[PDB]
Motif scaffolding. Structure first.
Motif, short mmCIF file in Angstrom:
data_model
loop_
_atom_site.label_atom_id
_atom_site.label_comp_id
_atom_site.label_asym_id
_atom_site.label_seq_id
_atom_site.Cartn_x
_atom_site.Cartn_y
_atom_site.Cartn_z
N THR A 1 -30.17 20.65 3.74
CA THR A 1 -29.74 21.85 4.47
C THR A 1 -28.64 21.52 5.49
O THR A 1 -27.70 22.29 5.67
CB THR A 1 -30.94 22.51 5.19
N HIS B 1 -25.37 20.36 3.07
CA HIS B 1 -24.92 21.20 1.96
C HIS B 1 -24.99 22.69 2.32
O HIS B 1 -26.04 23.19 2.72
CB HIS B 1 -25.74 20.92 0.70
N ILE B 2 -23.86 23.38 2.17
CA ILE B 2 -23.73 24.77 2.64
C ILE B 2 -24.55 25.77 1.83
O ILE B 2 -24.96 26.80 2.35
CB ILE B 2 -22.25 25.23 2.71
N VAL C 1 -27.54 25.15 0.58
CA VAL C 1 -28.97 24.91 0.81
C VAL C 1 -29.39 25.42 2.18
O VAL C 1 -28.77 25.08 3.19
CB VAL C 1 -29.31 23.41 0.70
N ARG D 1 -32.68 30.38 -1.09
CA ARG D 1 -31.35 30.96 -0.89
C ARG D 1 -30.64 31.18 -2.22
O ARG D 1 -30.64 30.30 -3.09
CB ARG D 1 -30.51 30.06 0.03
N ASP E 1 -27.99 29.04 8.74
CA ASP E 1 -26.53 29.00 8.87
C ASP E 1 -25.86 28.49 7.59
O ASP E 1 -26.49 28.31 6.55
CB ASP E 1 -26.11 28.15 10.07
MG LIG Z 1 -27.17 24.82 4.98
#
Ligand SMILES: [Mg+2]
Lengths: 231, 222, 250, 244, 233, 240, 212, 235
Positions: free
Chosen positions: B192, B195-196, B198, B28, B222
């Motif tokens: 994940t 943490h936003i 990841v 990401r 998400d």
């Molecule tokens: Mg995440």
């Protein structure tokens, strides 16, 4: 005579003697052969030793994964020019994500050598180069002279006694150009070509140097027992 | 005022085994609260059995990797195609980073491979080039979430042998590549969740004597 | 390109001679005669306007040049070399003096600056010496009236009166007989015209002779009124008519 | 290219001599003679102007004797224009030293500096050397009265009495004959003028052909005075010493 | 360091089965003033590449000249300039990306966000982003500025991952792009109704569409909206 | 800038500008160096063609580079000043950075390096100077004596001479200097140095200079009378 | 970070902790804060990690060039001054360094120089640098003697780092010990603070405030 | 005159060819490479008996694993040695490893053709560079002022070179021990030297993997000379 003191002086017949003397250094150098088909391009070089205790002077230099050359004449000048090619090949890849065309590499070498023939204080390069490569338009072979003249060829040879190999390639032209998808046979033709330039000495295991580049073949140099197969 | 730096998120993880090494990272790429790409490779094969990742500001990260890859190429030209050992690569990267000491590459760099005895190796760098050989190192956004877990589950920190009550430590037994990959996947699954920055995907590069292999796994989007 | 001549073109020969300077002096010797005479209340400098063609307008070619309001110059030798030296002399009077002290340089120091420029063309890389000898006449408050000769070597000497160029040897002998320390400016002009006639072949009039003086302040040539301390230039170039008037009393 | 026209001003001969220095010295041998004589109570500088004219303005003329500062002066033999370049540099060095240390520059330090500048033109740059030989007359509170000479090679030496320019061989022999250590300035003035009078290529030695200077502690009490002699003052000293 | 003066808003793009689509409106804003209404912000390079640019227009015009010069330079001593040695989308992007990062490293950036859309020699789709910081990334859908926030969510519903690309036709892709441009016109205060759209297909080549307009707009519901809470009339 | 290659090879492999710089050294006044057991003595010739000289102020032939090292020379006097200045600057730079004065070998190596540089740099000629560098290393009582020449080569010597008629005085030293037993005292060393110069000098008057350097920065120049006493004693033993 | 070095009868003891932090976050517990310049010279890391690492490796290169040219071991005085002169060139640019250059030569004996990024170069017998320097000084000052044995000196250095590791939040991990002799330095192991604290508490009777 | 970088009608650089003549006037240096190490030996050739011969330094350390011997204008070698030492140390700084002997030699040879109208002339000295690395083992190189370097099993440079090289042609084989090489260098040096060979006018050195580069003591060399004398008298 009176017009050979520097590179900045034309003779009365319009000749540049310092350039011609630089050309003479190539003729003293050891023989090297270049030839290609539509899939591969090959360099073959006869290395020269100082004596029986000494190593055989390397003749072939890699410039990139898809390009490289062989030398005949002043070796340090080949190191300077090959270093320049390495940088230009590298600039093309880093800036444009593009492998440098062999024809464009020849143009760059021509222009670099030319500047050394028109200015005071400098000297011409004292080496001849045979550049092989595989790019987006297939296999290529170039011949560089330190006069600046670069020429694209099917095959050629430079150095001492190179005329014998060059005549052989001129006869074999129609045969070796058709050797597609067979690296070993193309090298055989090159080893047979360079053999037409030998006298007194023959091709031994530390004498012979071979390089190849092609469709799915990175530029690779073969020395030592790796060329015993072709002796 | 022009800010030459940015934050592209991402999290990376390097672990050195007995005869192997892994370098993992999520795929990401982000700025602020937006996703730029769900699959933008961050860990790279740099040749000579060395894998590298420069996490943080992606522009600086790409630049450093590009210059190191270039350094490997020229090392071959200048030193008769000699293989660049992982320790030599590490010292070289220090000089690349410290060369911009007063305008730093805003990244946390990790490389992985094998040392000259064939044992697994991981090296970790700060933005200005200080480095160390380590057994275990997470980097980037969720590094603070992952490292404590690795201290516990890789080095068996605070774990003792039942019945002795604190007197005898849990012995440091070696982990297989299958065992390490499990810990990597659980590290990123956990990161994940909390943490936003990841998510999306996990790409792992495994280094052995046989070469470099890749594995990919989906992460929550998400 | 680049100036690759970074070495001296003037060098000592085995006999101790600086060839290029000697040859520059030879070029001066071939040049048209010019002279200078110092009086008690002024200085006069004069030369012949050797017109290269009658179609040429010789008024547009100034052999006698104003350097400062109180300093003038004339030459013998290569005209183009003189013209550029005048440009440099005018500028150096400002840059190395007037912009520092707020006043024009005294004659001897401007001469010193011109001399330095000529010396450097005798030692610097890739240049030949200037092919001129200058005669510089001027006035300043503390030194009074003065006359200097400057040679290609950069050497300069103060004179009561002298001549340079073609007929200098004969002219200097003529001046030695006529000069005294009690001459008035009009007497010096008269002697100048007499001396100059000997070295001139063809026409001898106001249109073929160039003559200037360093004398009294000319408030009519200042261009403005209102400042008592500013009284006008002492350098004045004589007109064609003014010369012809004095040729009747010759 | 340009190499063709290069004289190579900074090369040794097969004998180990510097061509241009030797030829510059040959030039200086044709210059007017300059003499310096050091006494216990001062220094004398005497010098001959080269074949002058009656129309030369002598009282405003200076070709031989130059002031470097209030304590140091020089006599010139050679190209006057070359000398002025070096003289202005020496004047600046003296002021640089005075600004830095708040003391007047010692004589030898000034002499060494100018001599080093001359030396440089013989070793690098490809330019011709300065065709000048100096006699330095000066005073400082370390060594007192001092005489030096420097030549185009950049070599300098100290002297009790010395000559440069024309007829130095004849002049030096005459000085060596009559010089004594307990000599005084007034005696040295006479020796200098007598020596010039015998060595001169002119028919007779007159005031208009001479430049003269003295450095004396004949300055009221514990200080030093430089005296560049005027044309009338040179005429008087010529009569006093009985030459005219 | 500077500030942008005359600016262009969102550039949006996506991959489909046989190629790529890219779009951008024809406005050059001067702060809140909608100053220039005929600005082309999609610039084709050859017949295989379209470079879409947002941000500072003076820098866009500079970049436009760099690309024009690139084509000239590539043709020099190049017999295969219109064949094997023609400029690729990947060559053009890498060049721009080099320039952008160099300029940010001298603290004098080109104040832009750029998307290079094209089709490679082997038929592969090319779509990659670069901005004033030299930051680069690739994705099945790419958008700049407001497009990143509003277009991407809509375009990602069509192509959500790599495996959706072969399933997406040019009609479906163009439809999605055109709808996204309408949404941006509703919601971006620095957008215009007029836009350009470019399709680069491996079979049909480069199709460049000018003077397109946002149509089929919903406004009728506005007539029923009254006051801000309690007002009935 | 002036870039002309003045020092170049000839067909026989000689650099004539360097060799002609040696001919300048041959012309220079004779210099000699002799090291005893606990001292080094530097002797120098003064040509008596120049009288009316002021010996107080005239540049002396032996120069202190630091408080513990001295330098003498044969050749162009003006050239030697440039080498002496550079050496003196380097000596202070070494003290400043290494916090220790230069060794005699280090100072020699630096001066020799400068001389070499001027033999393959564009636009410059070699130094027409050979040097004798003598002294004692800090906190060391072993005598040091080195020689340099225009080419830039340098080496250590038990005793050495340079300049005009140096062939003759080297002849003397080679038969009179014993390595197994060097001049055990200052007296013996000075005596042997004066003797060596007397083979060449002429009058033993103001033509001979002698400088004695001992350990721990103990450097002193002998006066005319002190040297004259050596000159007297040498010839009175010779009358036999 | 806490680092100390002190001179004594048997040479020099160098002792350091192993913790590196970024704010409150503990980045590493296994940092090597003693830089092995060469087999005879040691340097300590405090301030900027990169600045110390980079320039003290560089120092090792300069020391190697010195002994190749001079055919003699470089003095601690000369080695320390090469580093201090270098960082003084960079003064103002933002280098962060606080180090002890430690060595033992024939002419000097055991020698320690404190070198610092604002140009300071101090010779001394005892130095302490870092966030936990004050704690280590207390133990050092009250127990130091010149006539300590190598064994007791090693322990004193170890105990002083432990004191700092306990109280200073930004110090800890493990203790690295070195003993510098004339024939070179000798490494005396890595000692985990967690295990060392309890061991010392029991054997010594110290830290009665802490429950064990 | 003529350019410093001028080609002759035969295609050779005048200045390079002339520098080779200066090297022929230099004192003899010999190198022999074996599988147990490389030996380097030189003729000191003191110009006078008062010259302290141990101050003649014609064998020099570049790094622990690389040594070097010189012949010709030996003053020119100092900047070459400085560059070599710097290159060796710099590479170790950049790469945390020893530099390859060939790479070091190539770096030195890159200086050679940096002359023109850079330095004003070529170097007037030839170098024998001997060393060891892990990739290619024990190596001996001959670095010339042309910029060319050849690898050699054995090589002699200087005034007695062609006579010494002919001798090395006969004596060298691939199974030589270090001790055999030491005596062989001594034997050939003794053959070509003007003066009688002893421990004061000749010097030995070697490079081994274990101990690195070492210059031999005069006492150590004296024993090897005595060993040589006896074995030549043995037949
Ligand atoms: Mg995440």
């Amino acid at each position: 005579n009176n017009y050979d003191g520097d590179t900045v002086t034309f003779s009365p017949t319009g000749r540049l003697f310092q350039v011609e003397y630089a050309l003479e250094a190539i003729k003293q150098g050891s023989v090297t052969v270049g030839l290609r088909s539509n899939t591969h391009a090959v360099l073959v070089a006869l290395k020269r030793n100082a004596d029986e205790l000494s190593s055989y002077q390397k003749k072939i230099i890699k410039c990139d994964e898809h390009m490289g050359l062989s030398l005949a004449g002043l070796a340090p000048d080949a190191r300077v020019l090959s270093n320049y090619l390495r940088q230009q090949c590298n600039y093309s890849s880093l800036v444009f994500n593009r492998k440098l065309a062999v024809e464009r590499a020849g143009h760059l070498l021509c222009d670099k050598a030319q500047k050394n023939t028109q200015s005071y204080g400098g000297r011409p390069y004292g080496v001849g180069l045979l550049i092989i490569g595989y790019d987006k338009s297939g296999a290529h072979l170039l011949e560089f002279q330190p006069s600046g003249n670069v020429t694209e060829l099917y095959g050629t040879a430079i150095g001492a006694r190179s005329q014998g190999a060059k005549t052989y390639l001129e006869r074999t032209l129609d045969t070796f150009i058709k050797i597609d998808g067979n690296p070993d046979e193309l090298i055989k033709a090159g080893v047979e070509a360079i053999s037409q330039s030998l006298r007194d000495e023959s091709l031994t295991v530390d004498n012979l140097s071979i390089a190849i580049v092609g469709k799915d073949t990175p530029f690779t140099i073969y020395d030592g027992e790796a060329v015993a197969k072709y002796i | 005022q022009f800010n030459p730096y940015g934050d592209n998120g991402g999290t990376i993880l390097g672990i050195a085994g007995e005869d192997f090494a892994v370098l993992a990272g999520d795929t990401r790429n982000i700025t602020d609260y937006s996703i730029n790409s769900r699959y933008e490779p961050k860990v790279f094969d740099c040749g000579d059995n060395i894998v590298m990742s420069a996490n943080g500001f992606a522009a600086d990260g790409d630049a450093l990797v590009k210059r190191f890859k270039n350094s490997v190429k020229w090392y071959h030209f200048d030193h008769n195609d000699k293989k660049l050992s992982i320790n030599s690569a590490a010292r070289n990267i220090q000089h690349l980073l410290y060369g911009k000491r007063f305008f730093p590459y805003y990244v946390h760099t990790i490389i992985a491979g094998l040392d000259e005895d064939g044992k697994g190796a991981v090296y970790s760098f700060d933005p200005v080039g200080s480095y160390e050989r380590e057994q275990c190192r997470a980097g980037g956004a969720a590094a603070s979430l992952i490292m404590p877990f690795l201290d516990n589950q890789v080095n068996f920190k605070n774990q003792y042998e039942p019945g002795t009550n604190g007197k005898v430590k849990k012995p440091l037994k070696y982990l297989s590549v299958e065992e390490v990959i499990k810990l990597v996947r659980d590290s990123f699954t956990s990161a994940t969740e909390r943490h936003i920055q990841v998510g999306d995907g996990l790409e792992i590069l495994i280094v052995t004597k046989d070469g470099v292999r890749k594995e990919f796994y989906e992460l929550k989007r998400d | 390109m680049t100036d690759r001549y970074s070495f001296s073109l003037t060098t000592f020969s085995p006999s101790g001679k600086l060839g290029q300077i000697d040859y520059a002096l030879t070029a001066v010797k071939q040049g048209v005669t010019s002279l200078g005479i110092k009086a008690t209340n002024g200085v006069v400098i004069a030369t012949e306007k050797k017109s290269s063609s009658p179609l040429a307008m010789s008024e547009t070619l100034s052999k006698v040049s104003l350097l400062t309001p109180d300093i003038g110059a004339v030459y013998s030798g290569m005209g183009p070399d003189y013209r550029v030296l005048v440009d440099k002399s005018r500028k150096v009077a400002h840059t190395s003096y007037k912009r520092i002290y707020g006043e024009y340089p005294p004659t001897k120091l401007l001469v010193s600056e011109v001399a330095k420029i000529m010396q450097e063309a005798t030692q610097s890389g890739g240049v030949r010496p200037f092919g001129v000898s200058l005669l510089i006449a001027g006035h300043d408050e503390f030194n009074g009236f003065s006359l200097y000769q400057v040679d290609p070597s950069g050497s300069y000497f103060p004179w009561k009166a002298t001549a340079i160029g073609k007929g200098s040897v004969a002219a200097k002998t003529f001046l030695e007989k006529r000069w005294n320390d009690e001459l008035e400016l009009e007497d010096a002009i008269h002697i100048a015209l007499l001396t100059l006639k000997e070295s001139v072949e063809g026409e001898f009039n106001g249109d073929t002779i160039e003559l200037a003086i360093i004398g009294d302040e000319n408030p009519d040539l200042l261009g403005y009124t209102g400042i008592p301390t500013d009284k006008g230039p002492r350098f004045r170039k004589l007109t064609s008519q003014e010369i012809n008037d004095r040729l009747e009393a010759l | 290219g340009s190499r063709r026209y290069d004289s190579r001003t900074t090369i040794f001969s097969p004998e180990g001599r510097l061509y241009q220095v030797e030829y510059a010295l040959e030039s200086i041998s044709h210059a007017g003679t300059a003499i310096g004589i050091m006494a216990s109570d001062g220094i004398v500088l005497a010098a001959e102007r080269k074949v002058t004219s009656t129309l030369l303005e002598q009282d405003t003329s200076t070709e031989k004797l130059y002031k470097l500062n209030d304590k140091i002066a020089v006599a010139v033999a050679g190209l006057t224009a070359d000398a002025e370049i070096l003289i202005n540099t020496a004047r600046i060095h003296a002021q640089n030293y005075l600004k830095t240390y708040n003391e007047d520059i010692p004589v030898e330090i000034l002499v060494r500096r100018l001599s080093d500048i001359k030396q440089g033109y013989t070793q690098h740059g490809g330019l011709r050397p300065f065709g000048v030989s100096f006699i330095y007359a000066g005073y400082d509170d370390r060594y007192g009265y001092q005489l030096y000479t420097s030549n185009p090679s950049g070599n300098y030496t100290g002297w009790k009495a010395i000559s440069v320019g024309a007829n130095t061989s004849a002049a030096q022999t005459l000085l060596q004959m009559d010089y004594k250590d307990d000599m005084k300035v007034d005696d040295a003035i006479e020796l200098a003028l007598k020596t010039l009078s015998k060595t001169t290529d002119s028919s007779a030695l007159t005031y208009d052909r001479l430049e003269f200077a003295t450095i004396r502690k004949g300055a009221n009490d514990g200080e030093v005075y430089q005296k560049i002699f005027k044309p009338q003052e040179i005429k008087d000293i010529l009569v006093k010493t009985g030459i005219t | 360091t500077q500030q942008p003066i005359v600016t262009g808003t969102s550039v949006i793009s996506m991959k489909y089965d046989n190629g790529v689509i890219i779009a951008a409106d024809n406005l050059g804003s001067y702060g809140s003033l909608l100053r220039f209404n005929g600005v082309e912000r999609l610039i084709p390079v050859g017949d295989n590449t379209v470079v879409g640019i947002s941000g500072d227009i003076s820098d866009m015009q500079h970049i436009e000249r760099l690309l024009k010069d690139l084509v000239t330079e590539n043709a020099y001593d190049n017999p295969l300039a219109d064949a094997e040695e023609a400029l690729e989308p990947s060559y053009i992007f890498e060049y721009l990306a080099t320039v952008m990062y160099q300029r940010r490293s001298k603290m004098n950036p080109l104040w832009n966000a750029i998307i290079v859309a094209g089709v490679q020699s082997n038929g592969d789709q090319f779509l990659r982003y670069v901005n004033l910081l030299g930051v680069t990334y690739s994705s099945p859908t790419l958008a700049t500025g407001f497009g990143a926030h509003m277009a991407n969510p809509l375009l990602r519903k069509v192509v959500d991952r790599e495996s959706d690309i072969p399933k997406t036709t040019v009609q479906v892709a163009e439809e999605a792009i055109v709808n996204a441009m309408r949404v941006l016109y509703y919601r971006d205060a620095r957008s215009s109704r007029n836009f350009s759209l470019a399709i680069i297909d491996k079979n049909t080549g480069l199709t460049f569409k000018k003077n397109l307009q946002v149509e089929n707009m919903k406004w009728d519901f506005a007539k029923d909206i009254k006051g801000y809470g309690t007002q009935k009339i | 800038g002036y870039d002309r290659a003045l020092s170049i090879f000839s067909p026989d492999g000689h650099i004539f500008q360097v060799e002609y710089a040696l001919e300048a050294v041959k012309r220079g006044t004779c210099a000699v160096g002799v090291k005893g057991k606990n001292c080094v003595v530097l002797g120098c010739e003064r040509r008596s063609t120049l009288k009316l000289q002021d010996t107080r102020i005239t540049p002396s032939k032996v120069s202190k580079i630091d408080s513990h090292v001295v330098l003498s020379f044969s050749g162009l006097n003006a050239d030697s000043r440039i080498l002496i200045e550079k050496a003196r600057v380097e000596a202070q730079s070494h003290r400043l950075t290494l916090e220790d004065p230069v060794t005699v070998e280090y100072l020699t190596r630096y001066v020799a390096g400068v001389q070499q540089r001027y033999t393959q740099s564009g636009g410059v000629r070699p130094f027409g100077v050979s040097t004798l560098i003598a002294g004692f290393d800090p906190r060391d009582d072993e005598p040091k004596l080195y020689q340099t020449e225009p080419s830039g080569i340098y080496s250590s010597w038990s005793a050495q001479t340079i300049g005009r008629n140096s062939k003759t005085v080297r002849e003397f030293l080679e038969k009179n200097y014993d390595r197994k037993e060097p001049p055990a005292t200052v007296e013996e060393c000075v005596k042997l140095t004066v003797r060596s110069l007397l083979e060449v000098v002429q009058t033993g008057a103001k033509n001979i200079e002698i400088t004695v350097v001992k350990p721990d920065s103990d450097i002193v120049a002998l006066s005319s009378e002190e040297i004259n006493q050596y000159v007297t004693q040498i010839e009175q033993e010779k009358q036999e | 970070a806490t680092t100390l070095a002190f001179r004594f009868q048997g040479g020099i003891i160098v002792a350091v902790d192993s913790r590196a932090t970024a704010g409150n976050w503990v980045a590493s517990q296994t940092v090597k804060k003693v830089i092995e310049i060469n087999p005879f010279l040691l340097g300590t890391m405090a301030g900027g990690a990169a600045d110390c690492q980079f320039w003290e490796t560089w120092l090792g290169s300069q020391c190697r060039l010195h002994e190749l040219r001079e055919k003699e071991r470089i003095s601690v005085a000369a080695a320390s001054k090469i580093l201090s002169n270098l960082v003084y060139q960079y003064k103002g640019a933002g280098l962060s360094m606080g180090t002890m250059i430690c060595g033992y030569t024939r002419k000097e004996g055991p020698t320690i120089y404190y070198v610092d990024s604002d140009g300071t170069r101090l010779k001394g017998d005892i130095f302490c640098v870092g966030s936990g320097q004050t704690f280590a000084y207390g133990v050092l000052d009250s127990n130091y003697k010149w006539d300590l044995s190598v064994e007791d000196a090693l322990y004193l250095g170890k105990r002083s780092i432990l004191a700092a590791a306990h109280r200073d939040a930004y110090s800890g991990g493990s203790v690295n010990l070195y003993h510098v002799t004339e024939d070179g330095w000798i490494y005396h192991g890595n000692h985990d603070v967690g295990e060392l604290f309890w061991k010392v508490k029991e054997e010594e009777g110290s830290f009665n405030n802490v429950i064990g | 005159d003529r350019g410093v970088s001028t080609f002759s009608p035969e295609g050779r650089l005048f200045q390079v060819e002339y520098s080779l003549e200066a090297i022929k006037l230099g004192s003899t240096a010999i190198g022999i490479a074996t599988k147990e190490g490389v030996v380097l030996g030189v003729e000191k050739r003191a110009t006078s008996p008062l010259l302290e011969s141990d101050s003649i330094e014609k064998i020099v350390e570049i790094d622990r694993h690389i040594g070097c011997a010189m012949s010709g204008l030996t003053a020119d070698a100092r900047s070459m040695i400085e560059h070599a030492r710097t290159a060796a140390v710099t590479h170790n700084l950049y790469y945390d490893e020893d530099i390859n002997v060939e790479s070091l030699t190539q770096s030195v040879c890159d200086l050679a053709l940096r002359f023109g109208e850079l330095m004003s002339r070529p170097f007037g000295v030839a170098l024998l560079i001997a060393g060891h690395d892990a990739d290619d083992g024990y190596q001996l190189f001959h670095a010339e002022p042309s910029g060319t370097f050849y690898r050699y099993n054995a090589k002699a440079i200087g005034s007695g070179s062609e006579g010494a090289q002919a001798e090395l042609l006969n004596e060298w084989h691939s199974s030589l021990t270090l001790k055999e090489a030491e005596l062989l260098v001594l034997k050939i040096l003794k053959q070509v030297m003007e003066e009688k060979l002893d421990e004061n006018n000749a010097q030995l050195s070697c490079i081994t993997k274990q101990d690195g580069f070492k210059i031999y003591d005069n006492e150590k060399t004296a024993e090897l000379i005595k060993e040589l004398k006896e074995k030549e008298a043995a037949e």
